[PDB]
């Protein structure tokens, strides 16, 4: 399989790269605004009740639909990563350079953070919820959950969008990528929160001023995404 | 990026333009009939309860599915705007002429209004609900919410349907456009109502004889749509 | 626009036509089995409660997904009508011959009826629910509801599947056709039941031995479907 | 129609075949992890309540989305069967060799079982639920339910993915295949559980150490899948 490529500053500062960074910022902002917004909407409707099944459905569907769109609207400009773990898994398989990937991370983190401060305002100052592992459940269980579900996501990105042999999968790729996240929130929501996405988790941690447990949402997703890049890149593109 | 184009009467009165106006009328009627209808259905089932999470899901899914369809069924005739803010954002980027755009607005407003009078009849005279900003929440918060979510919609229309480089996105564009509205209602419903669409809001205001607060659903969506046209048109098509 | 074509017996008894009839039987059986089945599932889970919002969502989503599939799996064999009103609207615009269309009706009615007797068995003898206009609501209101929502469906079939200029819409047509039915059930369920489909309504009327009010689900859908054929066929294909 | 083909060891041990087996393992693992996971999520949220309508929706949507993805991500490597009954129905119509098909079964069963042991861990040791026929309902009713719904699935796979004349259906095939399972769970969940898939059922039986009634989920799905292969393969591909 293709090796890691560090890239160059010239390449990573080209106008095409700059457009890509803006696209990643915008896609991540819009994804996180909707997705976090659905969780705040549930809190508003229920006066801050514990999550129930209708709420889980609302939040999962919102994230799946919004991520489909966020990926689609960047696909021809940046590739529509919307997610540091996607960028990382792609970098592991030589699909994006390291330098460009770092700038994608910055754009994604900025976009997510912006979305969360916008939410705080437009909702009239409601709390921005953070991802956390369920009460009582171990952190390793949470990490392993996040490894598995993020592996699923990044593997999907490889199979439908990166693979040169994708064929007609390329047309439906944004939808597959969004709806694997939706599906996986329906499973993982009550356990890890169903992040799959360090930026999605980071914005709220900034806006709520609370990084307790936040490491889970870097370690788990990066390992899952990296494992997907290693497996798909070496076996199915190698 | 392309400038605003005023157009001509000859062009805007051509048979092709007249077909486009009828298509916009029909698509907007069917979109608003379903979407408002889902809100009246919730009121019927619950005896006019406050919105809850099942209801929000029902209404969001209905709007997302219905808008997907309404866009698809006009895509090859009018472009499937279904929305004055989409038309406006496209006009800002030179994608539709101003004169033609004004006639699209008329067709959309007429279609929405018609849908709402039809609903009043077929439901046995139930109230046609109007979009309003949540009790206690400021109007600027509501406007800014609508700016953000309408920006998302119009940006999606640009990226998937207008951009000449859309490629395979063009096939899934109607679905992206519908499901961003669905996603954004799941976030915004309990705050602004999740309009994104001055015509969707206007029909009910006419049918309920209540324009209180209605300005929000012109100012917010037009600004969001205009900002999407400015950004995408000048950066990603320029 | 194209006129009505009566067709011929030779044509309507060809092997291609016979395959089409079997495909319509199978698609309609599978559509109605799922869709009615979701309503029986709700009754089982709730001990025959009145419809609530979760139930409406379940039933609407089931029908939208199932109809998408039923249309897709016949699209290249029969055209995937799955619905006497679709067949009728297509016949009005010269898209299927009258003789072939009558045999499609028979196949659809048989498939729906079969599904409903299968359901009665596999559910352990539970009642097969019938479409009815809501208590107190007038029959004309119910008919007009069904006209509007069936117009939407058949117009969608024309715009995405019949029109020679459909282009990329043809790829997503089955999904548009399914999800307009889903959307429209979210609106119409508590009022007319959201049929759009004389066969979908007829199977249960046979299996429950109850044709009270059943005429609504022929008059409303046939008029809507016929109006869609007249408008689209003469304006947008003429 | 094409006959059954036994195949060869050389063919079934080729690198292409080995890649296919890994893809089937991964797709089935990810499908079952999400889908079973959604059922465990419901149990967590509700403290092990009986299934209700929100829960049925959550579980059906999760399975439909996850299966769409699992099929898509194997489509160009293995064909994306994810299901012994799909493999069997395809084998009946000569679309996969018997030897290769047996190895697909092994990969699918292993993947499902792995998913279920992973779930047991990451959820903090919660019970892995098994498919069972509803209390009081006969086993033949359960089998016949599973025949019908699995026929639907495998017929969909033939019509959209196997048929050489699939045309544009091939692009949307993964989505049709996923959403027929979603639809059919909305009908069958409270009666048979809505399996359609011997591997999906088998993983939990292993992880819960409970094979009571499990035969239903081999007999019903294999017969349905085999009947779909016989009908579609001989009539619509013959």
Residue numbers in the entry:
A (entry chain A), B (entry chain A), C (entry chain A), D (entry chain A): 1 to 238
Relevant lines from the article:
Tonoplast Intrinsic Proteins (TIPs) belonging to the Major Intrinsic Protein family, also known as the aquaporin (AQP) superfamily, have been shown to conduct both water and ammonia. Crystal structures have established that AQPs are homotetramers, where each of the monomers holds a functional pore created by six membrane-spanning helices (helix 1‒helix 6), five connecting loops (loop A‒loop E), and two shorter helices (helix B and helix E), both displaying the AQP-signature motif Asn-Pro-Ala (NPA). Substrate specificity is thought to be achieved by the aromatic/arginine selectivity filter, which has been defined as four residues located at the noncytosolic end of the pore.
AtTIP2;1, solubilized by n-octyl-β-D-glucoside, was crystallized at pH 5.0 and the structure determined at 1.18 Å resolution. In the reported structure, 238 amino acid residues are resolved, and only the N-terminal tag and 12 native residues at the C-terminus are not included in the model. Accordingly, the structure of AtTIP2;1 constitutes an open channel where the cytosolic and vacuolar vestibules are connected by a pore lining eight water molecules in a single file. In line with this, TIP2s deviate from other AQPs, and as expected from mutational studies and modeling, the wider selectivity filter is mainly due to an isoleucine (Ile 185) at position H5P in helix 5, replacing a histidine that is conserved in the water-specific AQPs. However, the most striking feature of the AtTIP2;1 selectivity filter arises from an unpredicted positioning of the arginine at HEP in helix E (Arg 200), a conserved residue in nearly all AQPs. In AtTIP2;1, the arginine side chain is pushed to the side of the pore by a histidine located in loop C (His 131), which now appears as a fifth residue (LCP) of an extended selectivity filter. The novel position of the arginine is further stabilized by a hydrogen bond to the histidine (His 63) at position H2P in helix 2, which occupies essentially the same space as corresponding aromatic residues of water and glycerol channels (e.g., Phe 81 in SoPIP2;1, Trp 48 in EcGlpF) without direct effects on the pore aperture. In contrast to His 63, the additional His 131 at position LCP in loop C points to the center of the pore and forms a hydrogen bond to a pore-water (Wat 2). In fact, structure and MD simulations concur that loop C leaves enough space for a continuous side pore reaching from the selectivity filter all the way to the vacuolar surface.
